[PDB]
């Protein structure tokens, strides 16, 4: 049903006067489609999905111009933030910016976002109304006063409610075969005898898209979190995702336990039970 377009910018200063490194990646849902990397030779926005390669030279020329403009702002922002936090040039520092839009089933606007981080913590964020700002600390209050007086929220709002949604719809139709799919998880359970006294049940979900999934354990139909382990959802490298959930159980009590899988691609949520 619902969809998102998100861009992720990472700008890292070098010790001393070295040029910073600027990285940009774009996603539709869990599917990467563009990259920029100032360390690479091209100095161009580059395609990273087959369906974006159909866009002509005007598209690539435009995205390259814009991403270089973003890098020049981030270059100055690294300098300003060293000033606001009284830091020397000798240390490497990071700015991050994430922005984009979500649409529902009707492919109409649902929400926009723009968030900015310095050295791995919040710095400033646009609130959900796309009209006002959250400053994380006293330095960010300067940025907030500046961006309010300049009506920066109005400019972002026009992009997030307008451009961002119009292009997400174009990408969804042009990349339909890859972006409008759900790959249901391939599921199975394993059993490993840790000792004579305990066994590990491991519930597996493989080859699914999109990445959003819930794996839970139950014992006699009640939630079980004690003696369970859940790994982070991980990319397969082929456009699909993987995840597992394990529970350590007393030998002879395996049949009390069920694994539960929820995913957009499943007709119905799955219940797995260890079968000898």
């Amino acid at each position: 049903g619902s969809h998102s377009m998100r861009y992720f910018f990472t700008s890292v200063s070098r010790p001393g006067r070295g040029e910073p490194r600027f990285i940009a990646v774009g996603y539709v849902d869990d599917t990467q489609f563009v990259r920029f990397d100032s360390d690479a030779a091209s100095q161009r926005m580059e395609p990273r999905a087959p369906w974006i390669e159909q866009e002509g030279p005007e598209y690539w020329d435009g995205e390259t111009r814009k991403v270089k403009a973003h890098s020049q702002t981030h270059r100055v922002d690294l300098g300003t933030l060293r000033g606001y936090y009284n830091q020397s040039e000798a240390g490497s520092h990071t700015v991050q910016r994430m922005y984009g839009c979500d649409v529902g089933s009707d492919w109409r606007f649902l929400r926009g976002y723009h968030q900015y981080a310095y050295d791995g913590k919040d710095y400033i964020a646009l609130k959900e109304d796309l009209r006002s700002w959250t400053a994380a600390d006293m330095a960010a209050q300067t940025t907030k006063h500046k961006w309010e007086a300049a009506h920066v929220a109005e400019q972002l709002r026009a992009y997030l409610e307008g451009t961002c949604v119009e292009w997400l719809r174009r990408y969804l139709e042009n990349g339909k075969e890859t972006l409008q799919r759900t790959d249901a998880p391939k599921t199975h359970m394993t059993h490993h005898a840790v000792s004579d006294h305990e066994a590990t049940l491991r519930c597996w979900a493989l080859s699914f898209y999109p990445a959003e999934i819930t794996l839970t354990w139950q014992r006699d139909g009640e939630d079980q979190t004690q003696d369970t382990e859940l790994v982070e959802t991980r990319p397969a490298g082929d456009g699909t995702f993987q995840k597992w959930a394990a529970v350590v159980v007393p030998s002879g009590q395996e049949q009390r336990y069920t694994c539960h899988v929820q995913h957009e691609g499943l007709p119905k949520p799955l219940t797995l039970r260890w079968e000898p």
Binding site: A69, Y123, A140, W167
Partner: peptide
């Protein structure tokens, strides 16, 4: 596509 207008912090 990305945006063009990026006011410094």
């Amino acid at each position: 596509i990305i945006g063009w207008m990026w006011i410094p912090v």
